[PDB]
A = this chain, B = another copy of it.
Amino acid sequence: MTRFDVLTVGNAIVDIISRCNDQFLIDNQITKAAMNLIDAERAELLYSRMGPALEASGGSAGNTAAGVANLGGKAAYFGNVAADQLGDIFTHDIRAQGVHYQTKPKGAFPPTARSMIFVTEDGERSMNTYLGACVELGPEDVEADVVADAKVTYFEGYLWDPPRAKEAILDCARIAHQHGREMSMTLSDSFCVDRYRGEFLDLMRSGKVDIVFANRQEALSLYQTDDFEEALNRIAADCKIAAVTMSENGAVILKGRERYYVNAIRIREVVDTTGAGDLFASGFLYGYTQGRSLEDCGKLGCLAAGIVIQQIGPRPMTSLSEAAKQAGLI
């Protein structure tokens, strides 16, 4: 038996969420639909301009782990919070979902990471992230037994921003592959890809990463192209399996020359897109670690993603396993 289906590793963040008008993003020089890194001064400034908000546990990989647990898989998470109230919220929410979470805070300062997420009328989300205690995630936080006992270890491209997190991930790759497990990553954000393009390609080409998640813009950014067909051909050559999402156009799963196209589900309304890619990964990796076909993995991904975008909060509040049963994906 394997202790865990999916271990995820990422920046442990609490989301601070508010709806804004289109002009707010322009006035504050916030890049729409992107992850904008901010310092403590800028965090204070933006918060002062933000309307009344709601808080919810976030973090890309955090959300993915939670989604796997929701669907019925066995999940674990590495990510560093502070010993403060926001850290306690994060710890509570992930553990309450039944995700193994044991990363120890190193003190109260720097404080727990937070992201101010501004949701526009079109449902797009623009994130402004102070990493705080995330900068302290390092090799000391790798629970080697957990990596050793997880079918897939999945990590964020976002981890290349803090200083020592990459060293943890290299340790995870070694342990995972020594124990016959698979490694996976998400490209996270097109500007993140702009920052770490060479490093990400090296991860794939050296075989440190076996399965890659991207959206259209991230794939385009990875190869600095406007040609989506080129991006697909190249990503298929650079990694064993690629899952590429295309928003309302669903997704395509690539393996060698194999291509499997999957439709997006029908939705009532795009309330808030926060978590879409994270939950696509949840559904895909749940399917994958249950031995499902790549097409069915895609379908599970699109189902979870479609559900999360119809609510406020990056982690579905409803039962994904029940939704999967109803959709006949079981």
Give the interface of A toward B (CB within 8 A): 19, 47, 50-57, 66, 84-86, 89, 92-94, 96-97, 111, 312-313, 315, 317
Contact = CB atoms under 8 A, between A and B. Distances in A.
B93 A52 contact: yes
Contacts of A19: 317
A86 B94 CA distance: 19
A312 to B, nearest CB: 7
Contact of A97 (B52, B56, B312): B52
A66 B85 contact: no
Given A312-B312, A317-B19, A55 B54 contact: yes
A56 B57 contact: no
Contacts of A312: 54, 312
Contact of A54 (B47, B54, B66, B94): B54
B84 A47 contact: no
Contacts of A47: 92
A52 B315 contact: yes
A56 to B, nearest CB: 5
A15 B73 CA distance: 30
A328 B57 CA distance: 39
From DSSP, what is the main secondary structure of chain A's interface residues? mixed
Contacts of A97: 51-52
Given A47-B92, A85-B84, A85-B86, A57 B52 contact: yes
Nearest to A69: B52
A315 to B, nearest CB: 6
B96 A55 contact: no
A14 to B, nearest CB: 9
A94 B53 CA distance: 10
A109 to B, nearest CB: 12
A257 to B, nearest CB: 41
B93 A53 contact: yes
Given A84-B85, A85-B84, A313 B54 contact: yes
A78 B93 CA distance: 31
Given A84-B85, A85-B85, A86-B85, A96 B51 contact: yes
A19 B56 CA distance: 14
Contacts of A85: 84-86, 111
Nearest to A52: B93
11 contacts: A19-B317, A52-B92, A52-B94, A52-B317, A53-B89, A54-B54, A54-B55, A54-B56, A54-B312, A84-B85, A85-B85
A51 B85 CA distance: 17
A313 B55 CA distance: 11
Given A96-B50, A312-B312, A55 B89 contact: yes
